[PDB]
Amino acid sequence: DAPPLTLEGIKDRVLYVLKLYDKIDPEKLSVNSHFMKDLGLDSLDQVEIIMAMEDEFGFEIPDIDAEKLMCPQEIVDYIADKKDVYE
Amino acid sequence: FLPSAAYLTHQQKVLQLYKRALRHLESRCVHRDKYRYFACLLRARFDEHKNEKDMVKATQLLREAEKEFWHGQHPQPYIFPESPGGTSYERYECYKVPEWCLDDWHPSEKAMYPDYFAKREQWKKLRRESWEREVKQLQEETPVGGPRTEALPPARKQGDLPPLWWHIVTRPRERP
Amino acid sequence: SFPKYEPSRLASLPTTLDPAEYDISSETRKAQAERLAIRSRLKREYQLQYNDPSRRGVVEDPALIRWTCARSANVYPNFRPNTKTSLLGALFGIGPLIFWYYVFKTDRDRKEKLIQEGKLDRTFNISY
Amino acid sequence: SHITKDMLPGPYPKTPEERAAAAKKYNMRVEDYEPYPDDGMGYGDYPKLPDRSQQERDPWYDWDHPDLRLNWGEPMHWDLDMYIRNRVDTSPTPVNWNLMCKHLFGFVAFMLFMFWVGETYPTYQPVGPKQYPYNNLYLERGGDPNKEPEPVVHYEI
Amino acid sequence: MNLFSSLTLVTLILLTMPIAAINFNTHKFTNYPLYVKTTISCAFITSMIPTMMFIHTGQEMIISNWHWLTIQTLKLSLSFKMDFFSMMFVPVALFVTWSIMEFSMWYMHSDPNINQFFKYLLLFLITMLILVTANNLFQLFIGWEGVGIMSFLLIGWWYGRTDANTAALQAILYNRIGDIGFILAMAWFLINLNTWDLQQIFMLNPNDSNLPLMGLILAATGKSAQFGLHPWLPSAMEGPTPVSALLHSSTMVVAGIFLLIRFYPLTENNKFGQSIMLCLGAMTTLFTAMCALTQNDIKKIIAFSTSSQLGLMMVTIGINQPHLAFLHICTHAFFKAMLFMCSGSIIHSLNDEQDIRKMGGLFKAMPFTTTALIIGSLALTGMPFLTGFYSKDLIIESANTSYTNAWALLMTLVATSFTAIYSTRIIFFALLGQPRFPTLININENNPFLINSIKRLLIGSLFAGFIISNNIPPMTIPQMTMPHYLKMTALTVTILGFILALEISNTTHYLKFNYPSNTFKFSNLLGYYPTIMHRLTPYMNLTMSQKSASSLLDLIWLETILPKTISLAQMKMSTTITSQKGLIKLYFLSFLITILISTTLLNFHE
Amino acid sequence: MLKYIIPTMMLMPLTWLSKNSMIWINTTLHSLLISLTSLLLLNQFGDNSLNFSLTFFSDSLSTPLLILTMWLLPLMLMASQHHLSKENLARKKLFISMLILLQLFLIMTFTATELIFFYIMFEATLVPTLIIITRWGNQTERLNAGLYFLFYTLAGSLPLLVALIYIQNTMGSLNFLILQYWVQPMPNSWSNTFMWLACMMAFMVKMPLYGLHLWLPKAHVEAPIAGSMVLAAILLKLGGYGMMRITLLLNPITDFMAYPFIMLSLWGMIMTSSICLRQTDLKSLIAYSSVSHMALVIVAILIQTPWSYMGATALMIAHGLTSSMLFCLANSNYERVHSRTMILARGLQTLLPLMAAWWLLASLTNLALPPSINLIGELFVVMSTFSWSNITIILMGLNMVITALYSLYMLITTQRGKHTHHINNILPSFTRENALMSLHMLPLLLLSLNPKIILGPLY
Amino acid sequence: SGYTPDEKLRLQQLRELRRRWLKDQELSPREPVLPPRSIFAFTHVLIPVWIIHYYLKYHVTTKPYTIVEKKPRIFPGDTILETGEVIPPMKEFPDQ
């Protein structure tokens, strides 16, 4: 029992649950858009978003990674490192 | 206790405390709605005396926070079924056969699998060809005599693959 | 609000309330950086000697060999007979021996004098 | 090969050269190296460690030996064989240690005490004994077909 | 009867073909699971007959052949007896394990080491059968250690996973404690009664029944996960799922009290022993009851539940009522086989979460296993009046109507209330709440194998307890004459537990943030027993083996006492004698002192 | 039996005048033929033992041990390649001929008429094993190990000769038949105590007991596989055999002076099981296992029940087979990685899949596999010692628990949990290792079927 | 904070290499593998029954002290099959 993933679908689901969140906009919601650069939201709220990622996908990401995600592209890249779905 | 640096940060210590407190609060609180309530309560508790610019008072109240947190820990946390100490923890290690093997098959089994073995052979030639001169020129010239980090710069200038790539790229899938 | 979590040799002390991760002066910063340089040098040497495609044999850790040779052969030197070590040896070797010897004295004298009286439970006691 | 200077003869005196060569051979900081000291218990001049090392060394560091907690270069602990996971869990307990042992022993003493109080205070019900018909199952108890038949009978009440 | 003996021996022998078949394969099989399933079904259709012939007939017989070591006044052959409980207990185990074959076809469907798995599982069944059929006690010992080591292998199936081999080591160590108890009983039997043969044992029942009974108690607590020797049971739940189902549903978990059932004329006497029986079982029951609250691992929850049921069976052995305990074995076996199978179906269908944290709303998420789990946890404590009514409630009726401890009855009281309340808790946290598990769902249980397995075991859970309880001869005097609040008291305890857990769930709905009042700690950190013992006693022997054995008795001190003194003495005598510098006057003065010391000191002429 | 001695004299020059790549098959084949030829031995019946000549007589104590020796030879003779294939042809011939000469003195030792001949062939057994382990020890202290071995076994076995000449000139001839008929109780003097302590102490040293077992770990970690298996199985069980024969005389004082040997045996068995629980260097674990089982053998000898003797000889044969198998497993691990340690080579469930079956089966045979001969021996010894004392069952069962424990840890340290993924030089499982394991364990299960052979003369 | 761009470059090269490796592991030549080259239940339920029923009659009953019953139960309303006599039944019940 193991349905394999896809790159586009996991990007869509990450951007989906980001768009569910409050203090950002659905207007300019880019995968290639950082957090401290243009959005200005908190590092505290950044790790809240990290926790939302983990509670969707059911595994920890460690602390030395947790400093250095900062954007949804590297989020999708690191969960693609974990689950390793590269057809 | 980290690969790149030596000390975390003050803020990184506070951040790890926040993540572990949020995790232990998950494990304490069922039904998810009062959990969202108490999570906003703890977010406000960090909002109480966040923005001070002291050092000694900051680390002192952080110590007292650690004391009242080690009191307020849940004893059997809901760790995910991939965590160390969890439920899987290399659950499928039975089929995590390493990739240095499989050369010692009988060649009848190589006649069974022609295409994968020929492509692994050209991977191996790619491994051996781009190995000594450039990669070891980087790893013998480009750092200081003290390395002072566990990272490595890529093959950033001209040519081949970034150094020491083999047993990190060529690894099992972690899920057969 | 808390009894400060007394540690023991069994119960460990967690990494939060150290409290040595608080007044981290630049001497200790320098020491942690030196320890990081140590681990960096070790893992760099290992990863050099490890990823070689022409390499066939084992990695030959001298730390494991050093621990084994210290644990087995490098015990008998260095030795000095201390009075505390000698008394602890004669207590941990002869104490239980004379203890079980006294109890075998006791049980055998009781059983042999009981069967010399003849009042054993030997209604049938074949498989001796 | 294997140089003789990678064994460990001799103890910790004297303090410049022994600690120097220990930092050399053990790959450690000089003040981080600690002799035991020597007390006639062998031990050579082997390093003293922080001595827990297994519920320490948190797993997300991703070192080289994952089920050994090594790094391929370490002072391995002298008593490492007791330390490894699957052998002894040296975790920080959630509560205490003395509070744990005292309340467990108190619970055991309480339960065994009430067991002895039960052993002097049985249950019984308003029921007499069983009036077995034939001399309390004689000839189907121990036997004696001609030795001792005994006159004893119940009277109906 | 040639028919009767022949059919029992072929129920033995049909569980011998598949192991040697795949060891004689030298090919590639595909439907070896189907082969094992159909031969277990064949074993069941053979073993259904002799029970029917038994209750129709009686004729309670023993078979024995292939003797070896007729050495002294005994002889031991492969020797087993088909009697009442040892005959009707076989088809229950066969049918339960047939369901487990189905559930293992589903559960391990994507893991191609299934052939070695079914070989280990079949050999475990064979060893358990050889245990439960025997009267020659050495064959009991064979089956005893064999199911211990097959339990080791099935727990440590997943190599890797330090939890697994840790658990398996703990289990096998506590089973060696069972082994020392059993061999003490064996030694007393050999030396005093010339053999270990229950015919001769029950022909000559002595009044000194103290040392073998203590051996029996130690074997019982080593096998049946009792107070102080329990914690290998949740540790054993750390294995795979149908592994745990077979391992602690029917097989391997009742075998300790099975021996005490088997020795019932031996334990007709020595009321000191039955007092120890019931007090020990009450201790297990309430201890695992108080530990059983506040736990969030479903396998460990059902482990605590079956430990409590084993405690009630120990009570049932303590009162002179062995046949109620055997009926509880059968009902409990069907019951928690079905229960483990249901919960494992849920967990494997829902991405191996397994935890009550992030479990809640699974009502109307697929309704088949929800019906299964509510029939299970309702049949727990015996909703009147069902299969689980009969066993547990005749247990408590005979317990209250006896010369009991007057503390053990209170233990059964409070622990029956406690198993009612965690039954309510496991239902409410498993099905009824809000659905808490992440998105990208795999919500399905469509499988013909699984629906037929759950199907046939709940159908067994409806009828077979009543069917077994009816057509058996009452080997005891039934009490059946109770005052007020002595027969209704089971229903009273279960309904008050339902109300108490109902208001616990009402407080669970609220938002309060209650504080850990340290009964929380004592109930959720396992009663502190695995923590304290597994940090104390491994530290003891491993510290003494370092200090005393390694560095203090054998190596360094023995090499100083025997070789060193001799070798250094000879070295010093050499360096004193042969280190004479080469003079001449010294040698002739040595001649002179030799002549003088031979003449005048120790004379030789006189 | 002379028809068993003389083909071994014929088997020696076979090795010499066979040529290159021709010695090996001839020696292996013909020693297997001798295994058939002395499988034909067991004619023993009823009242007496099978007794043919002034030269020879064989008990059913000597029968399974002699069959075990000649069966263990060709298995070993195949086992000792891969470490002398690169050596010289002449040195290879010297090695194989030394093994054959050692077998010859083993058979001479087992079928001795008078105990003087037993002593001569006893130290004749002693001498070539030294040469084997010293010429091919393959570790830096084979010097110290051979030195300890020869000095302990001589200087413990030295007053035995004096005591045998004393029994010669006090009671007529020393043949075991007439000594069986001309025994008489020699009561509590002090010279009787010294003489008993001399004979029993010599064979104590041969077992070894706990008091001076220290030569035995070095003699198994610093020896090749052939001398290791010969040493452990045939030499230690030969010491037990010799004590079994000499203990027929000197019955009246063993109740007075047999107490402290029982004590040191039991407490040293417990301490040996403790010390093997923790150590590294996997090869040594089998050696301390041997010390534990032979302490159990010694307890079984000094209590004097026929139950005890039958369990003793069962434990002898079973631990001989188990320890030789487990030595060859450790040799296979040492051929894979050049470590000899315990924590380095890990994993090996993935790699070498049917090697796991043999490790599991070996740890089962150490674990007292429930119909195995090992459990039969341990069980009957526990029976006889619980007859001897009602309180010593505590130490026996504590030995049982720790025995299961260290056998299981010996299993799961090496072949459980994680492959270290840096070794990458192991060859796949050879047919040689699996062939040697099928040669080890099929006879053990056959003897587990009908064990009326392996029970001793008090059957 | 975040990555240094050297780590970004290194990691994107490892993106390309790791994707190429895991795609190369995905084989499909349309053929991964290639090989170069009632009565069932009848035997498996009759044949051990035949062998054991043959074994349990002749040899094992010529061994004398072999398999033995616990005797059937006879009641005061029964009769013996082989010899043949009834048992005189029990007397009056009354005041049941």
Swiss-Prot record, chain E:
GO MF term (any one): NADH dehydrogenase (ubiquinone) activity
The record describes its membrane topology as: Multi-pass membrane protein
Q: Does the keyword Cell membrane apply?
A: no
Which Pfam families does the UniProt record give? NADH5_C, Proton_antipo_M, Proton_antipo_N
**Enzyme Commission code:** 7.1.1.2
What Gene Ontology cellular-component terms does the record carry?
mitochondrial inner membrane; respiratory chain complex I
| The organism of origin for this protein | Ovis aries
Q: What is its main location?
A: mitochondrion
| Name under which the protein is recorded | NADH-ubiquinone oxidoreductase chain 5
Q: Where are the transmembrane segments?
A: 4-24, 43-63, 84-104, 114-134, 140-160, 171-191, 213-233, 241-261, 272-292, 301-320, 325-347, 366-386, 413-433, 457-477, 485-505, 582-602
Assembly and oligomerization: Core subunit of respiratory chain NADH dehydrogenase (Complex I) which is composed of 45 different subunits.
Any one Gene Ontology BP term? mitochondrial respiratory chain complex I assembly
Catalysed reaction(s) here are:
a ubiquinone + NADH + 5 H(+)(in) = a ubiquinol + NAD(+) + 4 H(+)(out)
Name its cellular compartments: Mitochondrion inner membrane
User: Which purpose does this protein serve, as stated in its record?
Assistant: Core subunit of the mitochondrial membrane respiratory chain NADH dehydrogenase (Complex I) which catalyzes electron transfer from NADH through the respiratory chain, using ubiquinone as an electron acceptor. Essential for the catalytic activity and assembly of complex I.
The kind of enzyme this is, by top-level EC class, is translocase
Give me the gene this protein comes from: MT-ND5
Annotated keywords:
Electron transport, Membrane, Mitochondrion, Mitochondrion inner membrane, NAD, Respiratory chain, Translocase, Transmembrane, Transmembrane helix, Transport, Ubiquinone
Q: Which family does it belong to?
A: Belongs to the complex I subunit 5 family.
Curated annotation (Swiss-Prot), chain F:
Q: Which reaction does it catalyse?
A: a ubiquinone + NADH + 5 H(+)(in) = a ubiquinol + NAD(+) + 4 H(+)(out)
Query: One matching Pfam family, short form?
Result: Proton_antipo_M
Q: What is its main location?
A: mitochondrion
Decide whether keyword Oxidoreductase is in the record: no
Q: Which UniProt keywords apply?
A: Electron transport, Membrane, Mitochondrion, Mitochondrion inner membrane, NAD, Respiratory chain, Translocase, Transmembrane, Transmembrane helix, Transport, Ubiquinone
Q: Which GO terms describe its cellular component?
A: mitochondrial inner membrane; respiratory chain complex I
Q: Which PANTHER family match?
A: NADH-UBIQUINONE OXIDOREDUCTASE CHAIN 4
Q: Which family does it belong to?
A: Belongs to the complex I subunit 4 family.
- Matching NCBIfam families, A to Z? NDH_I_M
Q: Name the chain's protein.
A: NADH-ubiquinone oxidoreductase chain 4
Its source organism is Ovis aries
Q: What is the lineage of its organism?
A: Eukaryota, Metazoa, Chordata, Craniata, Vertebrata
